[PDB]
Write an enzyme that holds these catalytic residues in place. Structure first.
Site, PDB file in Angstrom:
ATOM      1  N   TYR A 124       0.861  -1.179   0.000  1.00  0.00           N
ATOM      2  CA  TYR A 124       0.000   0.000   0.000  1.00  0.00           C
ATOM      3  C   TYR A 124       0.908   1.243   0.000  1.00  0.00           C
ATOM      4  O   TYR A 124       1.487   1.549   1.042  1.00  0.00           O
ATOM      5  CB  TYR A 124      -0.930   0.049   1.235  1.00  0.00           C
ATOM      6  N   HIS A 150       0.083  -0.092  -3.984  1.00  0.00           N
ATOM      7  CA  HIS A 150       0.289  -1.314  -4.749  1.00  0.00           C
ATOM      8  C   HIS A 150      -0.797  -1.421  -5.814  1.00  0.00           C
ATOM      9  O   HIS A 150      -1.779  -0.679  -5.776  1.00  0.00           O
ATOM     10  CB  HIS A 150       0.221  -2.558  -3.852  1.00  0.00           C
ATOM     11  N   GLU A 172      -4.275   1.188  -4.800  1.00  0.00           N
ATOM     12  CA  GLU A 172      -4.921   1.465  -3.522  1.00  0.00           C
ATOM     13  C   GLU A 172      -4.066   2.328  -2.599  1.00  0.00           C
ATOM     14  O   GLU A 172      -2.862   2.459  -2.795  1.00  0.00           O
ATOM     15  CB  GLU A 172      -5.298   0.153  -2.816  1.00  0.00           C
ATOM     16  N   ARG A 226     -10.507   3.180   2.535  1.00  0.00           N
ATOM     17  CA  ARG A 226      -9.483   3.283   1.509  1.00  0.00           C
ATOM     18  C   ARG A 226      -9.946   4.097   0.311  1.00  0.00           C
ATOM     19  O   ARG A 226     -11.129   4.092  -0.021  1.00  0.00           O
ATOM     20  CB  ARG A 226      -9.192   1.879   0.960  1.00  0.00           C
ATOM     21  N   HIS A 254     -14.578  -0.931   4.803  1.00  0.00           N
ATOM     22  CA  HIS A 254     -15.133  -2.012   5.635  1.00  0.00           C
ATOM     23  C   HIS A 254     -15.996  -1.358   6.748  1.00  0.00           C
ATOM     24  O   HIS A 254     -15.867  -1.727   7.916  1.00  0.00           O
ATOM     25  CB  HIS A 254     -14.107  -2.951   6.333  1.00  0.00           C
ATOM     26  N   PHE A 291     -16.755  -5.558   1.771  1.00  0.00           N
ATOM     27  CA  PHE A 291     -16.449  -4.172   1.437  1.00  0.00           C
ATOM     28  C   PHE A 291     -17.659  -3.530   0.757  1.00  0.00           C
ATOM     29  O   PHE A 291     -18.341  -4.174  -0.038  1.00  0.00           O
ATOM     30  CB  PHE A 291     -15.374  -4.177   0.317  1.00  0.00           C
TER      31      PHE A 291
END
Length: 106
Positions: A38, A40, A58, A76, A91, A99
């Site tokens: 991350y 990535h 992300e 995210r 989440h 998600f």
């Protein structure tokens, strides 16, 4: 988009743009400047909804700061392979798995 809301956890056009301009200039510039996975590339398995095309990248956000906890985190922001903000995921009501989308996404 600008002024994105991930369920309850809201994010200013400043937050969206901060974390986005970050991976935009840190994902495939000439470095990583992240934890490990991350920033990535966006996995593939269980491909969630995002317009444009891809591949994507992300960046797990936070309520005032980029480069934070990635799994756990929930919240995210995710961009396209240039600089185009594709959308955010979270989440928020996932039970640590399922998600859901942010800012008009599902």
């Amino acid at each position: 988009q600008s002024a994105t809301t991930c369920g309850s956890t809201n994010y200013s056009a400043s937050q969206v743009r901060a974390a986005a301009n970050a991976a935009c200039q840190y994902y495939q510039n000439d470095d990583t400047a992240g934890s490990s996975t991350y920033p990535h590339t966006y996995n593939n398995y269980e491909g969630f909804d995002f317009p444009v095309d891809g591949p994507y990248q992300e960046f797990p956000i936070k309520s005032g700061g980029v480069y934070t906890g990635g799994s756990p985190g929930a919240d995210r922001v995710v961009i396209n392979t240039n600089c185009e903000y594709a959308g955010a995921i979270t989440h928020t009501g996932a039970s640590g798995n399922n998600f859901v989308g942010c800012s008009g996404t599902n």
